[PDB]
């Protein structure tokens, strides 16, 4: 459900930049 | 088997050679390869205090072996020997902050290396050497010496920020690489640690990409 | 300055050479070979796969006995294989991991290697302590070594990235002869069967014919628009074939001093890394950068088949002296035999 | 300076121009004759019997 | 220079035990298999034991099985033969001989010098002739035979020729019935027909005065011939 929320509303976290920064 | 005795002995010799090859390959696998590039005055030869063919350097910090290759000696066309370094962990680019023409062809080399058809999935550790010396020099004279179009105050902050932003803006393959920029102090003690961190991060990203989780 | 006069004289000589070549072009090879019946579709299957290398394979060379083989890879190892039994006879550690060529002596007693170190290393295979040890390290080149070929146990020819070729003696280890005249890096060379002449190709989009005795160029063949990465020699000894980066191969004759035939197709848009001829000479095998090897009819320009089964670039290609088998090596750390 | 290079180029071009040449037809005929002469000796052009083939074995 | 030096023999009583040792110098001992071969006080050569490089395969003869143990110490260039429950049939002179195996290698190339011990399904080789009076400059042709044909599917005929001069260890002459070893006079030649073989010597000299043996390497145990002696 949380991933559904992030996907459909607030798309801003759905970019490679967020994952790349979080992994680092 | 339908073999003779000598045939069996030859097979045994071949098996021993295979075993030796396996051990040597597994030993060579436990290493990290780096491509050390930059101007002759950049200080690449003194990048890590731990220390005509290709120039080779080797050092181990925090249980990790690193082999840095300097290939500035090879003055032939880079197109026909740059594919021998496609399987390396990272490119370590050193820039001389003080000298201006030096940093200019440093940008030229940076763009040339970053825009290759081979290094489309490799990252750069950019060491801005001569930090405080160039800071005092930029207090004396503005960055207009080379970055003439650049407009900024005489403070070191604006000039250094502009130089870093430039060196990161010549990049075009921003989709599959990430630059790690480090202000290099004269007595900097974090160089080996920074290389360690960058190598670990890029290897984690590599695992993520092959497994498809990235 | 009178340099303009010399330039004009050189231009006049070039025009004279061009006119002389054009006068001899009465007809085309295709017109003569129109009546020749096609070779027929060729079906080749992988007989032996040689495993053991753990990095990209850059060069290979066949033995005179037609059973032994030598291969070079960037792992830092030189490996001698027995093709029949797929057995490793010798493994040789190299001081420099960056190796890009290898050679097998005609007698089978020596091997050679070299690369970005700018040294040609000669190793002896027959020894009383039962091990391979370095016999010589020929130095004297300014750029990377591209190719090397033995003449006998005493002499060797190398080509390097200093836009130069060299002939070396070994018991003295000194540069006996030097061949200059190119403007770009020399990438390949091929010895004529009579081992008295050879040809070379360079990145200046040209090939040159050299006499080993004299030491000066005799003929220059041009017509390519990019670097020449490989060169072979016709079995007769009066023609040769080339391969370039613009996805074409050409056949040049010695007597007519002009090209006779070009091997290109629309689908092929990648460069050629290696080239070879068969025993009869009517089959031209050429590797490519699309992970493939194409077999052309040397007289009619008709692809008679392909050799697929490599997962990466085909770097080295070789046809055996008796003509029994063809061997290929790829960047995927594999050598294969296609009979 | 490069004047000696120009003299070398002129001399080499003069030497190369003086070589005698032959027409395309005779060279093509020689190549074709060599190709037809060794048709049987080529194992890779024709098929190879099992007895002759060393790599066929297993 | 290659030197295999063996020591450890002497006089022992029946039921004793002795550990003969063999030291190598001047070559890569780790890449060579080693054979122990004995010669009776006045008789022909007999095979005893074999150990391969890397200590992966070990063979003993039927006579000395259960009592002899062959070992090697690669980091110290040493070979050992431990013998227990000795008998009068074991009195002999023992030799170390090296062998290497790949495509086109010469085995049994170098023999040892000899250590003397004096206690208080097999192919039969046939060297019928024993004494040959010879004159320098002549030609001689020694012949020997076999029980099973020494020809294999690979195309090799596994027959080896050795010469023992008076007071010298045996020396390899020909391997695989046709190939001349290194350092041998060119006047020597070998020929065979799969079951019968001949070694021909042209321009005989005082050097070629001694006992000639032919041996088979087709399968274990390796068997020798009686020996044909050429004397002036």
mmCIF file of C-alpha atoms in Angstrom, chain C residues 17-242:
data_model
loop_
_atom_site.group_PDB
_atom_site.id
_atom_site.type_symbol
_atom_site.label_atom_id
_atom_site.label_comp_id
_atom_site.label_asym_id
_atom_site.label_seq_id
_atom_site.Cartn_x
_atom_site.Cartn_y
_atom_site.Cartn_z
ATOM 1 C CA UNK C 17 51.527 6.773 -60.957
ATOM 2 C CA UNK C 18 47.741 7.164 -61.079
ATOM 3 C CA UNK C 19 47.748 7.336 -64.885
ATOM 4 C CA UNK C 20 50.019 4.288 -65.130
ATOM 5 C CA UNK C 21 47.725 2.314 -62.822
ATOM 6 C CA UNK C 22 44.591 3.409 -64.694
ATOM 7 C CA UNK C 23 46.095 2.415 -68.051
ATOM 8 C CA UNK C 24 46.550 -1.161 -66.818
ATOM 9 C CA UNK C 25 42.889 -1.438 -65.711
ATOM 10 C CA UNK C 26 41.615 -3.050 -68.899
ATOM 11 C CA UNK C 27 38.837 -4.965 -67.123
ATOM 12 C CA UNK C 28 37.569 -6.219 -63.754
ATOM 13 C CA UNK C 29 38.024 -9.438 -61.801
ATOM 14 C CA UNK C 30 34.243 -9.899 -61.756
ATOM 15 C CA UNK C 31 34.106 -9.918 -65.563
ATOM 16 C CA UNK C 32 36.712 -12.691 -65.682
ATOM 17 C CA UNK C 33 35.115 -14.725 -62.877
ATOM 18 C CA UNK C 34 31.516 -14.349 -64.120
ATOM 19 C CA UNK C 35 31.648 -17.840 -65.644
ATOM 20 C CA UNK C 36 32.998 -19.428 -62.441
ATOM 21 C CA UNK C 37 30.528 -21.746 -60.711
ATOM 22 C CA UNK C 38 29.813 -20.851 -57.062
ATOM 23 C CA UNK C 39 31.794 -22.471 -54.261
ATOM 24 C CA UNK C 40 28.623 -23.746 -52.595
ATOM 25 C CA UNK C 41 27.200 -23.222 -49.122
ATOM 26 C CA UNK C 42 29.665 -24.143 -46.371
ATOM 27 C CA UNK C 43 28.531 -25.788 -43.132
ATOM 28 C CA UNK C 44 31.061 -25.547 -40.299
ATOM 29 C CA UNK C 45 30.453 -26.707 -36.732
ATOM 30 C CA UNK C 46 32.465 -26.182 -33.560
ATOM 31 C CA UNK C 47 34.580 -29.295 -33.008
ATOM 32 C CA UNK C 48 36.732 -28.278 -30.024
ATOM 33 C CA UNK C 49 36.270 -25.505 -27.470
ATOM 34 C CA UNK C 50 39.397 -24.540 -25.525
ATOM 35 C CA UNK C 51 38.791 -23.291 -21.975
ATOM 36 C CA UNK C 52 41.157 -21.998 -19.321
ATOM 37 C CA UNK C 53 41.713 -18.331 -20.108
ATOM 38 C CA UNK C 54 40.105 -15.945 -17.623
ATOM 39 C CA UNK C 55 40.207 -12.691 -19.617
ATOM 40 C CA UNK C 56 39.903 -11.357 -23.158
ATOM 41 C CA UNK C 57 41.960 -13.228 -25.762
ATOM 42 C CA UNK C 58 43.924 -10.884 -28.014
ATOM 43 C CA UNK C 59 46.005 -13.058 -30.355
ATOM 44 C CA UNK C 60 46.738 -16.626 -31.398
ATOM 45 C CA UNK C 61 49.106 -18.397 -33.761
ATOM 46 C CA UNK C 62 49.108 -21.879 -35.269
ATOM 47 C CA UNK C 63 52.024 -24.283 -35.198
ATOM 48 C CA UNK C 64 53.794 -25.740 -38.206
ATOM 49 C CA UNK C 65 52.916 -29.276 -37.067
ATOM 50 C CA UNK C 66 49.231 -28.239 -37.382
ATOM 51 C CA UNK C 67 48.428 -29.655 -33.942
ATOM 52 C CA UNK C 68 49.949 -27.220 -31.434
ATOM 53 C CA UNK C 69 48.573 -23.756 -30.764
ATOM 54 C CA UNK C 70 49.538 -20.692 -28.725
ATOM 55 C CA UNK C 71 47.185 -18.089 -27.255
ATOM 56 C CA UNK C 72 47.590 -14.783 -25.420
ATOM 57 C CA UNK C 73 45.168 -13.072 -23.037
ATOM 58 C CA UNK C 74 45.276 -10.027 -20.777
ATOM 59 C CA UNK C 75 45.195 -12.175 -17.624
ATOM 60 C CA UNK C 76 48.980 -12.376 -17.979
ATOM 61 C CA UNK C 77 49.375 -15.899 -19.339
ATOM 62 C CA UNK C 78 50.609 -17.500 -22.554
ATOM 63 C CA UNK C 79 49.008 -20.903 -23.120
ATOM 64 C CA UNK C 80 50.087 -23.669 -25.509
ATOM 65 C CA UNK C 81 47.264 -26.059 -26.432
ATOM 66 C CA UNK C 82 47.082 -29.446 -28.111
ATOM 67 C CA UNK C 83 44.043 -29.103 -30.362
ATOM 68 C CA UNK C 84 43.409 -32.838 -30.780
ATOM 69 C CA UNK C 85 43.141 -33.763 -27.090
ATOM 70 C CA UNK C 86 42.288 -30.261 -25.757
ATOM 71 C CA UNK C 87 45.243 -30.516 -23.367
ATOM 72 C CA UNK C 88 47.386 -27.684 -22.010
ATOM 73 C CA UNK C 89 51.080 -28.287 -22.660
ATOM 74 C CA UNK C 90 52.593 -25.072 -21.286
ATOM 75 C CA UNK C 91 51.448 -22.079 -19.255
ATOM 76 C CA UNK C 92 53.820 -19.108 -19.216
ATOM 77 C CA UNK C 93 53.557 -16.116 -16.833
ATOM 78 C CA UNK C 94 54.162 -12.719 -18.435
ATOM 79 C CA UNK C 95 55.731 -9.754 -16.656
ATOM 80 C CA UNK C 96 53.328 -7.325 -18.361
ATOM 81 C CA UNK C 97 49.648 -8.251 -18.421
ATOM 82 C CA UNK C 98 49.037 -5.957 -21.416
ATOM 83 C CA UNK C 99 49.902 -8.260 -24.316
ATOM 84 C CA UNK C 100 48.469 -7.841 -27.807
ATOM 85 C CA UNK C 101 50.378 -10.256 -30.060
ATOM 86 C CA UNK C 102 52.067 -13.648 -30.095
ATOM 87 C CA UNK C 103 54.053 -15.757 -32.542
ATOM 88 C CA UNK C 104 55.089 -19.387 -32.952
ATOM 89 C CA UNK C 105 58.489 -20.281 -34.368
ATOM 90 C CA UNK C 106 58.390 -22.407 -37.547
ATOM 91 C CA UNK C 107 60.617 -25.022 -35.897
ATOM 92 C CA UNK C 108 58.471 -24.966 -32.752
ATOM 93 C CA UNK C 109 61.255 -24.090 -30.301
ATOM 94 C CA UNK C 110 60.452 -20.453 -29.462
ATOM 95 C CA UNK C 111 57.493 -18.187 -28.763
ATOM 96 C CA UNK C 112 57.198 -14.407 -28.816
ATOM 97 C CA UNK C 113 54.973 -11.858 -27.103
ATOM 98 C CA UNK C 114 54.620 -8.116 -26.687
ATOM 99 C CA UNK C 115 52.277 -5.229 -26.114
ATOM 100 C CA UNK C 116 51.982 -1.881 -24.338
ATOM 101 C CA UNK C 117 55.348 -2.459 -22.616
ATOM 102 C CA UNK C 118 57.226 -1.759 -25.903
ATOM 103 C CA UNK C 119 59.344 -4.917 -25.554
ATOM 104 C CA UNK C 120 59.252 -8.103 -27.636
ATOM 105 C CA UNK C 121 59.916 -11.073 -25.351
ATOM 106 C CA UNK C 122 61.245 -14.339 -26.806
ATOM 107 C CA UNK C 123 60.798 -17.518 -24.744
ATOM 108 C CA UNK C 124 62.507 -20.882 -25.272
ATOM 109 C CA UNK C 125 60.358 -24.018 -25.079
ATOM 110 C CA UNK C 126 63.038 -26.749 -25.250
ATOM 111 C CA UNK C 127 65.256 -26.723 -22.162
ATOM 112 C CA UNK C 128 67.126 -29.180 -19.933
ATOM 113 C CA UNK C 129 65.458 -28.074 -16.670
ATOM 114 C CA UNK C 130 62.003 -28.824 -18.093
ATOM 115 C CA UNK C 131 60.659 -25.279 -17.826
ATOM 116 C CA UNK C 132 60.049 -22.304 -20.097
ATOM 117 C CA UNK C 133 62.358 -19.373 -19.377
ATOM 118 C CA UNK C 134 62.940 -16.032 -21.069
ATOM 119 C CA UNK C 135 65.529 -16.145 -23.841
ATOM 120 C CA UNK C 136 65.469 -12.466 -24.814
ATOM 121 C CA UNK C 137 63.744 -9.109 -24.323
ATOM 122 C CA UNK C 138 64.181 -7.060 -27.506
ATOM 123 C CA UNK C 139 63.820 -3.347 -26.758
ATOM 124 C CA UNK C 140 64.144 -0.309 -28.991
ATOM 125 C CA UNK C 141 60.590 0.676 -29.919
ATOM 126 C CA UNK C 142 58.974 3.954 -28.875
ATOM 127 C CA UNK C 143 55.349 2.788 -29.098
ATOM 128 C CA UNK C 144 53.249 -0.274 -28.395
ATOM 129 C CA UNK C 145 54.007 -3.502 -30.258
ATOM 130 C CA UNK C 146 51.272 -4.541 -32.703
ATOM 131 C CA UNK C 147 52.532 -7.668 -34.496
ATOM 132 C CA UNK C 148 55.549 -9.954 -34.765
ATOM 133 C CA UNK C 149 56.500 -12.842 -37.051
ATOM 134 C CA UNK C 150 59.460 -15.217 -37.095
ATOM 135 C CA UNK C 151 61.574 -15.890 -40.158
ATOM 136 C CA UNK C 152 63.897 -18.473 -38.602
ATOM 137 C CA UNK C 153 65.444 -19.128 -35.190
ATOM 138 C CA UNK C 154 67.695 -16.059 -35.612
ATOM 139 C CA UNK C 155 65.574 -13.221 -37.030
ATOM 140 C CA UNK C 156 62.220 -11.601 -36.240
ATOM 141 C CA UNK C 157 60.140 -8.745 -37.669
ATOM 142 C CA UNK C 158 58.033 -6.502 -35.449
ATOM 143 C CA UNK C 159 55.754 -3.537 -36.092
ATOM 144 C CA UNK C 160 54.998 -0.902 -33.486
ATOM 145 C CA UNK C 161 53.039 2.269 -32.814
ATOM 146 C CA UNK C 162 56.033 4.526 -33.422
ATOM 147 C CA UNK C 163 55.019 4.346 -37.105
ATOM 148 C CA UNK C 164 57.861 1.902 -37.658
ATOM 149 C CA UNK C 165 58.746 -1.698 -38.453
ATOM 150 C CA UNK C 166 61.927 -3.468 -37.410
ATOM 151 C CA UNK C 167 64.018 -6.546 -38.168
ATOM 152 C CA UNK C 168 65.944 -7.971 -35.208
ATOM 153 C CA UNK C 169 68.745 -10.480 -34.749
ATOM 154 C CA UNK C 170 68.497 -12.513 -31.555
ATOM 155 C CA UNK C 171 71.903 -13.832 -30.429
ATOM 156 C CA UNK C 172 72.899 -10.138 -30.423
ATOM 157 C CA UNK C 173 69.442 -8.694 -29.695
ATOM 158 C CA UNK C 174 70.018 -5.615 -31.840
ATOM 159 C CA UNK C 175 67.916 -3.729 -34.380
ATOM 160 C CA UNK C 176 69.326 -5.041 -37.653
ATOM 161 C CA UNK C 177 67.019 -3.100 -39.978
ATOM 162 C CA UNK C 178 64.443 -0.328 -39.645
ATOM 163 C CA UNK C 179 61.514 0.368 -41.984
ATOM 164 C CA UNK C 180 59.989 3.860 -41.925
ATOM 165 C CA UNK C 181 57.629 5.681 -44.252
ATOM 166 C CA UNK C 182 54.235 5.441 -42.579
ATOM 167 C CA UNK C 183 52.417 8.377 -40.996
ATOM 168 C CA UNK C 184 50.167 6.409 -38.637
ATOM 169 C CA UNK C 185 50.396 3.495 -36.246
ATOM 170 C CA UNK C 186 51.270 0.225 -37.967
ATOM 171 C CA UNK C 187 48.765 -2.433 -36.931
ATOM 172 C CA UNK C 188 49.597 -5.637 -38.827
ATOM 173 C CA UNK C 189 52.128 -7.385 -41.049
ATOM 174 C CA UNK C 190 52.262 -10.644 -42.990
ATOM 175 C CA UNK C 191 55.291 -12.546 -44.274
ATOM 176 C CA UNK C 192 55.328 -13.785 -47.850
ATOM 177 C CA UNK C 193 55.767 -17.565 -48.237
ATOM 178 C CA UNK C 194 59.263 -17.040 -49.681
ATOM 179 C CA UNK C 195 60.110 -14.974 -46.531
ATOM 180 C CA UNK C 196 61.837 -12.328 -48.664
ATOM 181 C CA UNK C 197 59.089 -9.669 -48.749
ATOM 182 C CA UNK C 198 56.285 -8.601 -46.436
ATOM 183 C CA UNK C 199 53.422 -6.115 -46.274
ATOM 184 C CA UNK C 200 52.176 -3.790 -43.557
ATOM 185 C CA UNK C 201 49.077 -1.704 -42.962
ATOM 186 C CA UNK C 202 48.768 1.448 -40.908
ATOM 187 C CA UNK C 203 46.196 3.891 -39.549
ATOM 188 C CA UNK C 204 47.028 6.300 -42.393
ATOM 189 C CA UNK C 205 44.683 4.139 -44.529
ATOM 190 C CA UNK C 206 47.603 2.664 -46.475
ATOM 191 C CA UNK C 207 49.597 -0.525 -46.947
ATOM 192 C CA UNK C 208 53.231 -0.851 -47.967
ATOM 193 C CA UNK C 209 55.390 -3.618 -49.432
ATOM 194 C CA UNK C 210 58.868 -4.060 -47.946
ATOM 195 C CA UNK C 211 61.881 -6.116 -48.999
ATOM 196 C CA UNK C 212 63.695 -7.647 -46.027
ATOM 197 C CA UNK C 213 67.155 -7.526 -47.618
ATOM 198 C CA UNK C 214 67.231 -3.933 -48.901
ATOM 199 C CA UNK C 215 65.100 -2.192 -46.283
ATOM 200 C CA UNK C 216 63.074 0.299 -48.314
ATOM 201 C CA UNK C 217 59.498 0.371 -49.574
ATOM 202 C CA UNK C 218 58.818 -0.772 -53.137
ATOM 203 C CA UNK C 219 55.047 -0.428 -53.633
ATOM 204 C CA UNK C 220 52.317 1.452 -51.771
ATOM 205 C CA UNK C 221 48.678 0.347 -51.969
ATOM 206 C CA UNK C 222 45.926 2.815 -51.064
ATOM 207 C CA UNK C 223 42.161 2.999 -51.342
ATOM 208 C CA UNK C 224 40.925 2.464 -47.803
ATOM 209 C CA UNK C 225 39.249 5.330 -45.946
ATOM 210 C CA UNK C 226 40.224 4.257 -42.411
ATOM 211 C CA UNK C 227 42.774 2.325 -40.336
ATOM 212 C CA UNK C 228 43.852 -1.148 -41.451
ATOM 213 C CA UNK C 229 43.635 -3.592 -38.543
ATOM 214 C CA UNK C 230 44.632 -6.843 -40.264
ATOM 215 C CA UNK C 231 46.529 -8.022 -43.328
ATOM 216 C CA UNK C 232 47.024 -11.441 -44.908
ATOM 217 C CA UNK C 233 48.823 -12.843 -47.939
ATOM 218 C CA UNK C 234 47.544 -14.887 -50.868
ATOM 219 C CA UNK C 235 48.957 -18.448 -50.891
ATOM 220 C CA UNK C 236 50.568 -17.920 -54.308
ATOM 221 C CA UNK C 237 52.508 -14.872 -53.132
ATOM 222 C CA UNK C 238 51.419 -12.266 -55.683
ATOM 223 C CA UNK C 239 48.452 -10.631 -53.910
ATOM 224 C CA UNK C 240 47.110 -9.830 -50.462
ATOM 225 C CA UNK C 241 43.935 -8.889 -48.602
ATOM 226 C CA UNK C 242 43.193 -6.182 -46.046
#
